[PDB]
Amino acid sequence: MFTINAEVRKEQGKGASRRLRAANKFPAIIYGGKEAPLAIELDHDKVMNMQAKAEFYSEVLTIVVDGKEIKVKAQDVQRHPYKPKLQHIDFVRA
Amino acid sequence: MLQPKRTKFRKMHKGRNRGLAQGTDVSFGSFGLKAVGRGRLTARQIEAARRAMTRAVKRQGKIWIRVFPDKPITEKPLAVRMGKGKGNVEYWVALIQPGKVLYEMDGVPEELAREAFKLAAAKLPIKTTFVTKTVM
Amino acid sequence: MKVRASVKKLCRNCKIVKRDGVIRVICSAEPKHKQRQG
Amino acid sequence: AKKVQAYVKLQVAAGMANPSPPVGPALGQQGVNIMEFCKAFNAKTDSIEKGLPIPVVITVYADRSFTFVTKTPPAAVLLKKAAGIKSGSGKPNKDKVGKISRAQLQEIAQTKAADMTGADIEAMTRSIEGTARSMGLVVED
RNA sequence: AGCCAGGAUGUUGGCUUAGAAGCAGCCAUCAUUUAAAGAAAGCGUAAUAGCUCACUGGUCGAGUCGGCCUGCGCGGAAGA
């Protein structure tokens, strides 16, 4: 039931990702199925308050990117070590 | 006090304490006392903090000490010159980085876990925080 | 009073007041709870 | 009774007269008489049965000392008169110290209606069995 | 948040009760007329008692309460 608005990452690597997290976002990827993996940037606060729920890790999510909808499921989250924030999320298609 | 039962060599080099930690999630228990500062922790500080916790949440609960010393720290005596060998093994520390869950606790309410972890984080030299068991 | 570097509310009547750039604990119930300099 | 004007509740087992070791001037600090626990109180005690303390309201007026009427037998020694050992409770609920048959509590609760809170039999039945919860007295269902 | 009201009974619950009768004690920690109430949260006793509160009603007529992430600051801070 969660709708997560995303964009496509035109840049990647550690420079671009650390630039992207200082701007209060974080990178993510949608892989799985037969399609190519999709690099995605996500707003941070929406996803953090959203993942405070338990249903974020169990229910099918919907990610809106370029006006499409990809029904994914949250595979695996890298968190920051000592701060309450996120590094990265793997989303498997569903 | 914690100390390895049987080492392989008595004296270790200093080495450095860089980068982030490996034990990061609350694994065994439900609430966790996670490091934020770098530092290192002697066995006396781990014992002091564990007694503060065990007293604080009485003999209910279950507490895991997720760090272990296993690093011998040598000191030279007083009025001894420099040189003439490496010192003697005085105590044992664990090296901590930002992210280590130092302790875990289960079987209490969260408000007692806050209370015992406050009581015991004041016996440690590093800045510390409270974490919960997050699900993936 | 007690000049400490951690001043706290010891009672429920204790009350933190900053006077002249100094944090203080003014109690009405017990005057032993009067504190200064947090 | 009225606003609190020199009435307190104190004595021990009133089979005898005027308990000198346990309380003494505790019933002499306020305007309550020393003599009116000795003859007339036992004259008003023999009307039902002896061997019970009485927590009682003693309203001291501008009369001789006061006027007194005993009203209710209390449930402490009423739940100790047939409970088990005569020593006391200690830690009574974590083990099985006492046991009380509930029919006699239904009839004593059916008698006592002045100094209670309740208007139904079942409403005030397990209140005195709450006093059985107090001294760990296991009710026999 | 102020302000005006109510906040008990078994309950001396037994105590090692020398006085604890909620108050130097431990186990319990119940149930009811009731909007509401703890065998008493704070003080307090030679000792009950004395009050306030925890909760509810009225007055009140717009925000308020407490956490988290942060920038800059305050105290901690005494030498010839």
UniProtKB/Swiss-Prot annotation, chain A:
Annotated GO biological process: cytoplasmic translation; negative regulation of translation; response to radiation; ribosomal large subunit assembly; translation
UniProt-listed InterPro entries: Rbsml_bL25/Gln-tRNA_synth_N, Ribosomal_bL25/Gln-tRNA_synth, Ribosomal_bL25_short, Ribosomal_L25_dom, Ribosomal_uL5_bac-type
One Gene Ontology molecular-function label: structural constituent of ribosome
Pfam family name, one: Ribosomal_L25p
Domain of life per record: Bacteria
Entry GO terms, CC: cytoplasm; cytosol; cytosolic large ribosomal subunit
Family: Belongs to the bacterial ribosomal protein bL25 family.
Assembly description: Part of the 50S ribosomal subunit; part of the 5S rRNA/L5/L18/L25 subcomplex. Contacts the 5S rRNA.
Stated name of the protein: Large ribosomal subunit protein bL25
Gene: rplY
Swiss-Prot record, chain D:
A GO BP entry: translational termination
Matches recorded under InterPro entries: Ribosomal_uL11, Ribosomal_uL11_bac-typ, Ribosomal_uL11_C, Ribosomal_uL11_C_sf, Ribosomal_uL11_CS, Ribosomal_uL11_N, Ribosomal_uL11_N_sf
SUPFAM superfamilies registered for this protein in UniProt: Ribosomal L11/L12e N-terminal domain, Ribosomal protein L11, C-terminal domain
N6,N6,N6-trimethyllysine: residues carrying this PTM: 3, 39
Cell division recorded as keyword: no
Pfam family, one: Ribosomal_L11
Keyword vocabulary terms for this entry: Methylation, Ribonucleoprotein, Ribosomal protein, RNA-binding, rRNA-binding
One annotated GO molecular function: structural constituent of ribosome
Residue positions where N6-succinyllysine is found in the record: 71, 80
N,N,N-trimethylalanine found at: 1
Transmembrane domains' residue ranges: none
Gene Ontology cellular component terms for the protein in this record: cytoplasm; cytosol; cytosolic large ribosomal subunit
Assembly, per entry: Part of the ribosomal stalk of the 50S ribosomal subunit. Interacts with L10 and the large rRNA to form the base of the stalk. L10 forms an elongated spine to which 2 L12 dimers bind in a sequential fashion forming a pentameric L10(L12)2(L12)2 complex.
NCBIfam families registered for this protein in UniProt: L11_bact (TIGR01632)
Recorded family membership: Belongs to the universal ribosomal protein uL11 family.
Its biological purpose: Forms part of the ribosomal stalk which helps the ribosome interact with GTP-bound translation factors.
The protein's name in its UniProt record: Large ribosomal subunit protein uL11
Organism, as annotated: Escherichia coli (strain K12)
